[PDB]
A paper describes a structure:
Ubiquitin thioesterase OTUB2, a cysteine protease from the ovarian tumor (OTU) deubiquitinase superfamily, is often overexpressed during tumor progression and metastasis. Recent research progress revealed that elevated OTUB2 expression correlates with tumorigenesis and metastasis. OTUB2 can promote tumorigenic progression of non-small cell lung cancer cells through deubiquitination of U2AF2, stimulation of the Warburg effect, and activation of AKT/mTOR signaling. Moreover, OTUB2 has been identified as a cancer stemness and metastasis-promoting factor that deubiquitinates YAP/TAZ proteins in breast cancer cells, whereby poly-SUMOylation on OTUB2 lysine 233 mediates the interaction with YAP/TAZ. These studies demonstrate OTUB2 to be a relevant therapeutic target, and the development of OTUB2-specific inhibitors can potentially be beneficial for cancer therapies.
Here, we describe the development of an improved OTUB2 inhibitor, LN5P45, comprising a chloroacethydrazide moiety that covalently reacts to the active-site cysteine residue. LC–MS analysis of OTUB2 before and after reaction with LN5P45 confirmed the formation of a covalent complex by showing a mass difference of 230 Da, which corresponds to a substitution reaction at the chloride. The trans orientation on the other hand nicely positions the inhibitor inside the small groove leading to the active site. We determined the preferred absolute stereochemistry as (1S,2S), and the LN5P45-OTUB2 co-crystal structure explained the molecular details of the inhibitor binding mode.
Numbering used by the authors: 6 to 231
């Protein structure tokens, strides 16, 4: 469980980490709404790996939701080609992601899903797929995403260097692109109330996110609603 941990009670964030006790107030509030966390490896990939795992986990047993998600996934090869990705280059990453979608579709357990996401090779192929889809999404909407980058930076160069490569850290750009790309309603909770970084992924309670992530200093763990 080196890439995605077993569940820990939310208050482990305080009990195990003296360094977090300054965030006691936020964590104790979150503990009213969320019961548990899974920890993700801090390797530059944690957003993609957290969102992939958490969303597929959210689908287990929801056969209609799985069906509609499989349809979106079967369309992604065309989105990738429209963005200039050749099939022979994305095939193995598509196949890894398709495989874990079929695992969830065929009754699939949390245990079997965790095993794929803790397999370095399978998990990193899934992350690479999610990175290419993120890049494809941004490239296809250069006009929109152009607003959020460095004027001197080309959108294609941003994607080449800050989205496609493994271990490249996310900003709100990649979170927006991937969530829109797969229609994953995501909510990000912050550990640190004093962190001023604008949150583009917090909505009112009445919204129905699939995935809740817990953010601190470039790192995203998975949250479980109470
Ligand atoms: C989401 C994600 O993977 N976040 N990244 C981390 O937690 C990276 C920051 C930590 C790290 C890894 C290797 C080396 C250093 C100096 C930091």
């Amino acid at each position: 469980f080196n890439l995605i941990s077993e569940k820990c009670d939310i208050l482990s964030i305080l009990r195990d980490h003296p360094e977090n006790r300054i965030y006691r107030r936020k964590i104790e509030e979150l503990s009213k709404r969320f019961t548990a966390i899974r920890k993700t490896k801090g390797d530059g990939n944690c957003f993609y790996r957290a969102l992939g795992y958490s969303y597929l986990e959210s689908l287990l047993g929801k056969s209609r939701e799985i069906f509609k998600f499989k349809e979106r996934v079967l369309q992604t090869p065309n989105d990738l080609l429209a963005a200039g990705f050749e099939e022979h280059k994305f095939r193995n990453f598509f196949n890894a992601f398709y495989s874990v979608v079929e695992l969830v579709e065929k009754d699939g357990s949390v245990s079997s899903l965790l095993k794929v996401f803790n397999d370095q090779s399978a998990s990193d192929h899934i992350v690479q797929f999610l990175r290419l889809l993120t890049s494809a999404f941004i490239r296809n909407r250069a006009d929109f995403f152009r607003h959020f980058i460095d004027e001197e930076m080309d959108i294609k160069d941003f994607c080449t260097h800050e989205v496609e490569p493994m271990a490249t850290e996310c900003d709100h750009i990649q979170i927006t692109a991937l969530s829109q790309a797969l229609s994953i309603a995501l909510q990000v909770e912050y550990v640190d109330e004093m962190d001023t970084a604008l949150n583009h992924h917090v909505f009112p309670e009445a919204a129905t996110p699939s995935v809740y992530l817990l953010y601190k200093t470039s790192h995203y763990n998975i949250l479980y609603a109470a």
